[PDB]
Design a protein around this ligand. Sequence first.
Ligand code: APC
Ligand code: MG
Ligand code: MG
Length: 857
Amino acid sequence: NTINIAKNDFSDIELAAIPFNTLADHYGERLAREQLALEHESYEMGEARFRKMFERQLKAGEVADNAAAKPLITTLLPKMIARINDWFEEVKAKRGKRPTAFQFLQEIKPEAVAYITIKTTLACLTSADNTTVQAVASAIGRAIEDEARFGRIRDLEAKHFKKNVEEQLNKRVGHVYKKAFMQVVEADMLSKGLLGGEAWSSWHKEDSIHVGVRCIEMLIESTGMVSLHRQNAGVVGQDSETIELAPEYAEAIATRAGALAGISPMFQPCVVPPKPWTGITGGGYWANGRRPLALVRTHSKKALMRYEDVYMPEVYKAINIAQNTAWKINKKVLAVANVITKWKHCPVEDIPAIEALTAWKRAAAAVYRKDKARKSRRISLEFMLEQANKFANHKAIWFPYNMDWRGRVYAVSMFNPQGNDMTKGLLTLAKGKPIGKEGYYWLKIHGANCAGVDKVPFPERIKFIEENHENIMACAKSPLENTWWAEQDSPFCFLAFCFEYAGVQHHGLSYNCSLPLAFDGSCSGIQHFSAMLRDEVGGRAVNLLPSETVQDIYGIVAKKVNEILQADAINGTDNEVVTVTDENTGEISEKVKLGTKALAGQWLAYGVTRSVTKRSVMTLAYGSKEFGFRQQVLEDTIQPAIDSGKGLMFTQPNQAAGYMAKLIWESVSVTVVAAVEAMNWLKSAAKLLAAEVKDKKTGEILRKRCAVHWVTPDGFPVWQEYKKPIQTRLNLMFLGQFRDSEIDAHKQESGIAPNFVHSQDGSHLRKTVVWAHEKYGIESFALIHDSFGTIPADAANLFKAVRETMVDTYESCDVLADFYDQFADQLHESQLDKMPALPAKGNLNLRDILESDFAFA
DNA sequence: GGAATCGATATCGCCGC
RNA sequence: GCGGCGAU
DNA sequence: GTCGATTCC
Ligand SMILES: Nc1ncnc2c1ncn2[C@@H]1O[C@H](COP(=O)(O)CP(=O)(O)OP(=O)(O)O)[C@@H](O)[C@H]1O
Ligand SMILES: [Mg+2]
Ligand SMILES: [Mg+2]
């Protein structure tokens, strides 16, 4: 019984009587009457959102795992753990055989029990009918039992062995299986590890009821959450004492849930250009919803305020400029999806084209997930395709844009430009230009990108387009009769285009064409680093330097690795049988340690190509180094290998993947040395600044833990402040939640590298939005972090504006150093030496960028 | 110092138990 | 919180 | 299960 918010609350955002004459005037009565009734819906779609989710929270008893009920259990668990702590001193300070519950409740951490009760309590209390203290008490015990039993595993026996457990534990969902897991763990733990009995088999259902009853007692004692009243006293088959939730506390919830359901808005797009950003907040949507948009998406309220008075117009315009872009539904494209999705889970998934256990149960696991997604993935489809259907007859729709704490612009709504193929393919720009002989040279280029040809020179890409002109046309003539679009690396977009490419043919270059051609960078990551350090080797790689042949970072590190293989294939170490005794069993074993010489043999035997290197290198920007590739190598190619038929050669999977790692790791830390250096330098910087330098002779705080802060080239300032709570409260099979804060130096030193590049690309895009807006009449953009698009016509320009906006930023500054000046005077006296120097620069000439056909942006 | 522990892919979003 | 999805 | 790097004895 939740306080329906859908009253005077949402009523707030009045779509007919509010100071909205501002919009009316500016766009009209209808659109301004629309924008507000929409926004209003968003919330109405937000409340509903909350209810149905809250419905199944009660309907499974998980009403404790709901933010609506978590504020009570915060003042409710201190009262209850204290009373059980006095009660343990009440019978300990009194001779005579100790109560039935007290023998057991002396095994499970009291705090735990304390909670265990609260939860399963409210859970059964929200059941259909059965609330009797009989079944109730039975439940509580049932559970507490489990925790003293399997919590001993996590306490002494698997002190470290638990590592191998935790993992498969969390992965296990639902009370049942989690138990299924812990019993089988127990049966093998005493079968090898620590020995003893199982003094829980003596725990009769009686013992269980006993526990579950003395607790509840403690519960109505310490608190009044539940009043223990008699149900029809004076009857033999009706007089049963039962539990009821204190009407007061029930209101707390119904109320907390009420106000909650009103801050989860379903952000739609706008009917009228968004409300420019004046600062910090109030931006994007127009109404004054009980959920304003922040300029920046941040975690802590204070962190957002640090912006309030900051100056940065370069930035405020970017958002605003970019946010003004008008788009429209691709009415043609949509009636294609409107057909094929109603005849297929995935319009483009299947179209008629021309180690025993640990493996059989390996693929079995597959077949499970692969169907999880196929159903989650359609859950998102059904959404888009709906949104899309709402706004198909609208003349033009707009998207508000925030930023993440590090810069990056995002749209606000759910259905947005930064979608997936299908998504992006329903979205084309509202104002067009006529195309022109140069505007169409780019339609076509795009068309080449959308079909997968993009690592071959632009004429080529055009060759392609032209060789298949008939096809394309086919598709655009009749889309449903031809699946050639579909099979294309980006179908729904690539078919976006085919309807344009046939508009050209029917109207010659005078064709008004609003479709977003987009210029994607190579690996923004390495790029920036390689520029901010003039690394010609590296830039070459991401195509910072112009070339005739599209350079492919993966393909080249592939290379550098095949070169090491063959070098070990001839020299290198030989095998080696080393003895490995198990940590749990103490059993002796024989394991031959494949040597470089052979490992390679295999590698070579398998067939190393771009595809064995991609992921590792493409994530190299987020941190992964030598260690993290193993896992990747192994599962991204070694496993699916064996599990595919090939893989024979993979005698020691782990060893083959331990090795390939290092190879990769050596082959990239020489191709993008830049990225390597810049990242590590940065990583140092943050470590230091994270540290809590003291004197271990006073154990005195010399310079507390410093966060990290810098300012992007376009005026944006980023604040890397990762906080870790000092709490804790792990539970086994039920929950295990909440119980001040401090900077978590690890998170801190981790997230610098990525974040920094990530705020940087940030600046860069915000600038090209501006630059190419002011300097060239371009007023219509497609923004995807590292992907800029515009209409066929302004296209020619964009392409250059970027290669421009870029070289400007790297020429004019050295964020690396600038970044120094930022913390420099914050490094305590003592650490002034552990801070390595800014790596030397290179011989790259940024100005080359301006002529790199392939480093689009 | 030396032996004992955490940790290893970044930010945004949606959905779900 | 874990799971999955999707965006770079 | 390698590499190491930071913590407490
Ligand atoms: N290990 C990883 N973890 C998370 N996201 C990853 C990832 N590896 C790749 N991705 C994402 O997956 C996407 C891969 O798309 P692809 O089309 O395979 C890459 P690409 O950069 O166009 O090169 P390609 O043409 O060689 O495929 C990237 O957009 C990236 O953001
Ligand atoms: Mg690609
Ligand atoms: Mg990526």
